Amino acid sequence: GLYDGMEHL
Amino acid sequence: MIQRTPKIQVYSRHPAENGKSNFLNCYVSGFHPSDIEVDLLKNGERIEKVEHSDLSFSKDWSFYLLYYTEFTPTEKDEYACRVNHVTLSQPKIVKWDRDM
Amino acid sequence: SHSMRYFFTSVSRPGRGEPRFIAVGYVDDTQFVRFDSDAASQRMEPRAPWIEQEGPEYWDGETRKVKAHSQTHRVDLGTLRGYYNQSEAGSHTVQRMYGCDVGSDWRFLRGYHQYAYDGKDYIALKEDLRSWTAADMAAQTTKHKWEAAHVAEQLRAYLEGTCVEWLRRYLENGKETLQRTDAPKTHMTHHAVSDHEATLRCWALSFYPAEITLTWQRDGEDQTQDTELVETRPAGDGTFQKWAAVVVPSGQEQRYTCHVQHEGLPKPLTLRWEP
Amino acid sequence: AGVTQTPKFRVLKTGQSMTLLCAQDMNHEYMYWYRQDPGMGLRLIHYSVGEGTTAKGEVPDGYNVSRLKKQNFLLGLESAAPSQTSVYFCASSFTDTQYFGPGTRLTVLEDLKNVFPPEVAVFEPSEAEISHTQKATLVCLATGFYPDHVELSWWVNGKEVHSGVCTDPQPLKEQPALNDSRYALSSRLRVSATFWQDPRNHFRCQVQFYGLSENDEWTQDRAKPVTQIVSAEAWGRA
Amino acid sequence: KEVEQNSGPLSVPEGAIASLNCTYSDRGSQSFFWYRQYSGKSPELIMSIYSNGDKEDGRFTAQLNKASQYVSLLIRDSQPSDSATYLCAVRGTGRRALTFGSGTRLQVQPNIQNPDPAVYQLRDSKSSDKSVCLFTDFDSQTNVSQSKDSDVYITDKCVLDMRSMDFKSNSAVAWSNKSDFACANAFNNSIIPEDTFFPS
């Protein structure tokens, strides 16, 4: 199952 | 902006037995960027029913793809893999060498 | 030991609409899911029979998460153009990989989260899961934003926790395919290159997992100087192939042994040329 | 700045339109519009994951949004209804940690005839309290205001005080039976007896009322109930 | 429904533990937050939590139990200034927005060491007959009831903090237009202490 991180570069 | 030229291996899934059903594989790896053209050739003619794996990459970020088709080898039929990429001034053709 | 990995590729396509986004999921050397922004489904799709058991809640959630990542990466392509002073005329590539390793006991061993831009390292979570390696000045901007926002804390919760829980669930549900070993089928070929020398080629076929060692010895001494080893390659049926060659003097073939180590072998194999 | 919202307070007639502006200077991709009503808590109206994209939240109906620019998120009310009476909060985040703006209080009425500013009175400490406790409590009453758009503050020698102050968290209805009842609000300032007894000392209860604008129509005999400050005051005395 | 909290109010004495609890429906949720909101103010983040277990920050502890889908905030050594609404927020699977609970109101009762319950009468500074009744200095036991009358207005109890003297007091205010309204009669709809000082 995938990570749910909202972080942009 | 690094570019990396593809490595190419052409091989059958199982040991080739003439007139016995098999798969012809062209494995392209170690290339960047991801845009690439790969054809399987029967006697220098582009084969139509050619599938490929989902684009993935290695630890060094270089991409790999498996191109493949069902085939039935003979004594006489020639098979090859034709690859084009931005790193290549001309298409690279690798002949299937059964006896390797 | 075992691993779960996700691999993401985002490629800008000047004048041909939205960027290409491809995601693939692996447990060890077995692909189990894919997403492709150009496919008709617009869903996370199964790529192994054992993940097909998962119900709608799983498939809707994985679809929502992969499409959310594609949205993040569409914005990131734009941000990286700003950082590197690049126009929209060029095609650029963002690669991203994350996942977790476990030992034989299925306990956490380590976590990964790293990005590349145009085939070079951009930013990576260090092995301590608490700090970043920023490969250039652009990546230092990202690193400072992620430090201020405490990104490592939330990512560490996934890598040490959730990621391991998924891997254990998959290792249980897919045990017949994931917890198997296929030992290599081995043979040797011989080809004259001159009148005075020949190639011995040691073959390993139909093995799983991909990890294997082929070594040549001359009179019991490793020949790693003069061996060509080809990249391990997929057969296409879920198993792998490899070969290792050495050039030898004609008449001296029997001075050389090929050594095969693989998880699926109780004891290392030793092959020698037979007329 | 962090997260800023304008306006703070607005009265609308049913059918009037307005835009609430959310701004943030933090370069956040993610922005959010919520309403808050007693019983319901915060409900998301719309959100945006980046410039040029918006998405529906839990209660999108009757609202539109735009995110033409990364720094701003606009909430649009095309045709105000009494049901849109609420406190509106916008928020932004870098990831999922949200920072909230100060809030926008909106009241929507059929008829602006019901709008009244507060009357304000200050009640002086009793001698009995001073004697019994050595302490002096001032009381401020704000009365007859509608809607509930007030901020009550205390000023001692022209400086706002927070110490020794308690203001009711919500006003009482002067007529609990009536939908359009006007409101009352009390506050206390407690000082030392000695401080109260020094006549150099000036005590002011200030009520900021938020009512109609200069640009609102008004056809009544009584004064236009505009945004204004109503104060009452007392001097120390021995 | 997706995020559940009890509305309370939850009443605790100064210095006791306050436990604010929250449950959520989406098992895949990866982020959990506690916000504090003072009356008429904005939500303010107090804790975030991501991993199963405990996270401490001054007098605050957050605990997450993913298997039970249950998250808590503990306030240690609770103070009157912690009186507020506490909002639980959860981010669901693949969600790019928080879902808030409707909040739990916490009331932290000050410890009135030396009660001095009293009803005083205060006179309009601007010369008038007009006056208010001030019930003050009662301990955090006493409950003030709203008017059993109609033309009589009574406020809820209110804690003021004289910060320099480290002194807290409870008070409620009553007023009316009627002639038959007096401070002796004001707070009759509720049960004041026996020993309440009634000057005149």
Side-chain angles (χ1 to χ4, degrees), chain A, chain B residues 1-6 8-16 18-19 21-48 50-58 60-74 77-94 96-100, chain C residues 1-15 17-73 75-119 121-171 173-220 222-224 226-266 268-275, chain D residues 1-9 11-12 14-39 41-68 70-112 114-126 128-158 160-199 201-213 215-220 222-238, chain E residues 2-40 42-112 114-125 127-129 131-147 149-188 190-200:
Chain A
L2 287 167
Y3 175 52
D4 228 337
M6 290 171 64
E7 60 271 28
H8 293 89
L9 301 181
Chain B
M1 184 137 202
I2 65 96
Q3 304 190 322
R4 279 195 278 245
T5 197
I8 303 161
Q9 298 191 64
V10 190
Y11 55 110
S12 77
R13 167 184 303 189
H14 296 109
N18 289 313
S21 194
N22 204 322
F23 286 83
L24 184 56
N25 295 326
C26 190
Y27 182 63
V28 290
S29 64
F31 61 93
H32 221 292
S34 57
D35 269 291
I36 194 163
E37 199 194 350
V38 184
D39 293 300
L40 300 176
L41 306 188
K42 185 168 178 193
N43 297 317
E45 185 184 5
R46 204 205 88 106
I47 303 165
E48 276 199 322
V50 173
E51 295 194 311
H52 64 89
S53 58
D54 304 317
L55 180 69
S56 200
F57 51 86
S58 302
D60 69 1
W61 302 109
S62 76
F63 294 104
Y64 63 85
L65 287 170
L66 181 65
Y67 287 82
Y68 61 95
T69 198
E70 218 155 4
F71 88 132
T72 283
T74 62
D77 288 300
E78 304 269 287
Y79 291 97
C81 184
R82 181 175 61 217
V83 172
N84 201 21
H85 187 258
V86 64
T87 53
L88 296 184
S89 50
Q90 59 191 357
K92 201 175 273 191
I93 297 183
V94 179
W96 180 47
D97 179 342
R98 167 209 305 251
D99 312 290
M100 258 188 72
Chain C
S1 53
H2 296 284
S3 68
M4 186 174 65
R5 294 280 193 272
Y6 289 101
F7 303 90
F8 308 92
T9 309
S10 296
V11 182
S12 59
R13 290 188 291 189
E18 294 302 316
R20 185 69 180 280
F21 181 76
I22 302 168
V24 294
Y26 286 83
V27 174
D28 305 329
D29 304 312
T30 308
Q31 194 195 350
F32 74 100
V33 286
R34 71 149 217 164
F35 178 83
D36 183 341
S37 61
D38 284 359
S41 81
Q42 298 298 291
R43 309 270 304 169
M44 189 76 93
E45 296 169 51
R47 276 290 181 280
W50 56 263
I51 198 67
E52 296 189 41
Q53 298 165 27
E54 295 285 3
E57 176 164 19
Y58 179 84
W59 292 109
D60 285 1
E62 296 307 302
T63 299
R64 202 146 56 231
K65 282 184 293 179
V66 83
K67 292 185 87 194
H69 281 339
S70 81
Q71 166 56 219
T72 308
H73 292 201
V75 171
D76 290 344
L77 287 161
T79 305
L80 287 168
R81 285 195 325 264
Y83 293 164
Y84 289 105
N85 290 313
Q86 290 163 161
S87 85
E88 287 170 74
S91 173
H92 299 282
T93 305
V94 173
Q95 285 158 283
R96 178 195 195 172
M97 181 274 285
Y98 63 66
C100 51
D101 297 342
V102 296
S104 303
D105 57 5
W106 295 11
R107 281 183 216 280
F108 180 76
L109 225 33
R110 64 167 297 178
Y112 308 88
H113 185 45
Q114 51 206 224
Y115 291 76
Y117 186 52
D118 288 333
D121 289 350
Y122 182 78
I123 196 163
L125 189 67
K126 285 205 217 302
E127 190 170 0
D128 72 359
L129 306 175
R130 285 181 190 276
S131 55
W132 304 99
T133 305
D136 65 11
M137 285 301 308
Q140 273 159 65
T141 306
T142 301
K143 172 178 149 141
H144 298 167
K145 295 198 300 186
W146 288 6
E147 283 171 350
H150 301 291
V151 171
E153 191 192 334
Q154 178 172 346
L155 172 56
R156 188 169 59 256
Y158 171 82
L159 295 174
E160 277 177 339
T162 307
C163 182
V164 173
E165 291 161 13
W166 283 116
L167 178 49
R168 296 178 183 164
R169 170 183 185 76
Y170 298 154
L171 284 173
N173 295 355
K175 74 190 175 202
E176 183 71 34
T177 73
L178 296 182
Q179 300 192 54
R180 87 191 198 264
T181 72
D182 301 322
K185 304 186 212 308
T186 61
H187 75 275
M188 201 181 290
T189 62
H190 180 287
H191 295 288
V193 301
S194 321
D195 303 350
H196 82 276
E197 58 185 21
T199 315
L200 297 180
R201 176 168 298 109
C202 189
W203 284 92
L205 301 177
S206 208
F207 60 93
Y208 185 95
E211 175 55 33
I212 196 167
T213 307
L214 303 179
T215 300
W216 278 104
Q217 287 174 15
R218 186 183 173 266
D219 305 334
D222 289 327
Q223 294 297 102
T224 61
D226 294 42
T227 75
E228 62 159 340
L229 25 145
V230 94
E231 183 187 345
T232 299
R233 72 207 192 180
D237 57 5
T239 68
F240 299 88
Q241 305 178 355
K242 202 186 184 71
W243 61 252
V246 283
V247 179
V248 312
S250 316
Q252 298 218 339
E253 287 81 358
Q254 283 180 8
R255 304 277 295 269
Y256 299 79
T257 51
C258 169
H259 303 254
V260 188
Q261 307 162 67
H262 182 89
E263 186 188 311
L265 293 172
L269 291 175
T270 291
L271 283 78
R272 338 171 52 126
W273 175 243
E274 180 201 49
Chain D
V3 183
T4 54
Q5 273 176 246
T6 61
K8 299 139 54 63
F9 287 92
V11 189
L12 289 184
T14 309
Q16 298 200 133
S17 81
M18 74 165 151
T19 296
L20 292 80
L21 163 77
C22 187
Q24 49 87 15
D25 72 320
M26 297 178 279
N27 205 28
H28 287 172
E29 292 297 350
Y30 301 101
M31 296 191 67
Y32 306 90
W33 270 112
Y34 299 88
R35 61 180 284 169
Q36 183 162 44
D37 317 273
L42 284 168
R43 293 179 296 162
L44 186 64
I45 303 166
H46 291 280
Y47 68 104
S48 168
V49 302
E51 188 173 282
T53 180
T54 74
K56 294 176 172 179
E58 186 199 321
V59 292
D61 297 345
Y63 302 102
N64 64 81
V65 285
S66 71
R67 182 94 185 276
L68 269 44
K70 192 172 161 174
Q71 61 209 120
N72 299 323
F73 193 30
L74 303 195
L75 179 67
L77 276 73
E78 283 196 330
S79 180
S83 69
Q84 294 177 313
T85 292
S86 206
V87 179
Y88 293 86
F89 288 103
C90 79
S92 66
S93 60
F94 175 78
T95 49
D96 45 6
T97 295
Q98 291 189 19
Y99 301 99
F100 282 82
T104 297
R105 167 129 210 188
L106 165 59
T107 306
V108 179
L109 316 168
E110 302 184 333
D111 193 2
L112 307 186
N114 301 311
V115 176
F116 298 102
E119 279 171 45
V120 175
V122 168
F123 303 77
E124 299 180 342
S126 90
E129 190 201 353
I130 288 162
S131 329
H132 197 84
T133 68
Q134 276 49 249
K135 288 178 173 81
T137 311
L138 284 82
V139 165
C140 182
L141 287 193
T143 56
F145 62 89
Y146 192 94
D148 174 19
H149 292 188
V150 294
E151 301 170 328
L152 189 153
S153 57
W154 284 98
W155 301 73
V156 168
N157 308 317
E160 185 166 5
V161 305
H162 295 95
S163 191
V165 171
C166 205
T167 301
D168 306 330
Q170 37 224 101
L172 51 82
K173 275 166 183 214
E174 287 188 339
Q175 278 96 82
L178 278 60
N179 191 96
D180 48 0
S181 175
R182 301 155 70 173
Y183 291 96
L185 188 70
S186 75
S187 188
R188 13 279 194 245
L189 172 58
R190 204 173 204 180
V191 296
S192 80
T194 68
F195 194 84
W196 169 246
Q197 283 167 340
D198 176 5
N201 287 333
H202 180 253
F203 303 87
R204 190 173 83 260
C205 180
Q206 176 187 284
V207 184
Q208 178 75 67
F209 172 72
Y210 297 92
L212 308 182
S213 203
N215 316 350
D216 275 306
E217 181 155 345
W218 191 253
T219 321
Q220 310 289 321
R222 69 177 170 95
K224 200 168 140 196
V226 294
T227 293
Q228 62 185 273
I229 296 169
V230 184
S231 302
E233 63 177 40
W235 285 91
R237 41 177 277 281
Chain E
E2 316 208 359
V3 179
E4 299 270 29
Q5 300 175 258
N6 193 65
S7 75
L10 180 66
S11 189
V12 314
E14 169 170 20
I17 63 153
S19 195
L20 290 317
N21 304 309
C22 173
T23 56
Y24 61 90
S25 51
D26 185 340
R27 187 158 191 93
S29 306
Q30 304 279 105
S31 297
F32 307 88
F33 305 85
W34 285 102
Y35 283 84
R36 179 178 67 200
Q37 193 174 18
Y38 294 113
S39 196
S42 303
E44 193 184 342
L45 178 73
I46 52 180
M47 295 271 323
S48 67
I49 188 157
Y50 312 102
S51 320
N52 222 73
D54 285 22
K55 187 166 156 185
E56 283 191 13
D57 192 324
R59 296 178 299 109
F60 296 120
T61 300
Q63 184 171 185
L64 172 58
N65 182 343
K66 286 209 169 201
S68 307
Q69 296 183 26
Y70 198 112
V71 58
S72 287
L73 176 71
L74 206 61
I75 313 177
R76 286 174 257 112
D77 193 21
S78 65
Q79 301 289 311
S81 63
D82 295 322
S83 301
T85 295
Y86 291 82
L87 316 181
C88 179
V90 183
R91 187 161 69 86
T93 303
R95 304 300 176 186
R96 292 298 184 270
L98 297 185
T99 313
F100 281 79
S102 45
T104 305
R105 196 154 72 74
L106 179 63
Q107 299 173 186
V108 179
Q109 303 308 134
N111 181 41
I112 307 308
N114 293 303
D116 208 334
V119 184
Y120 303 111
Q121 191 183 121
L122 288 72
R123 299 302 304 271
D124 194 333
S125 73
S127 270
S128 193
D129 294 36
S131 74
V132 306
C133 304
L134 173 69
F135 176 38
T136 187
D137 289 340
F138 52 85
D139 76 357
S140 289
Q141 284 279 251
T142 301
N143 294 126
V144 179
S145 306
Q146 241 76 44
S147 185
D149 205 276
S150 308
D151 299 344
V152 179
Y153 304 106
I154 311 182
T155 69
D156 207 337
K157 69 158 166 203
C158 212
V159 177
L160 68 86
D161 180 2
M162 301 179 71
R163 285 203 280 264
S164 286
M165 294 172 176
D166 188 42
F167 170 83
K168 295 197 190 63
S169 53
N170 296 306
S171 71
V173 182
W175 72 96
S176 187
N177 322 335
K178 287 167 158 159
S179 296
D180 71 314
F181 176 73
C183 293
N185 204 31
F187 294 97
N188 288 17
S190 81
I191 212 78
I192 68 186
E194 297 275 59
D195 62 9
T196 294
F197 182 35
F198 276 92
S200 41

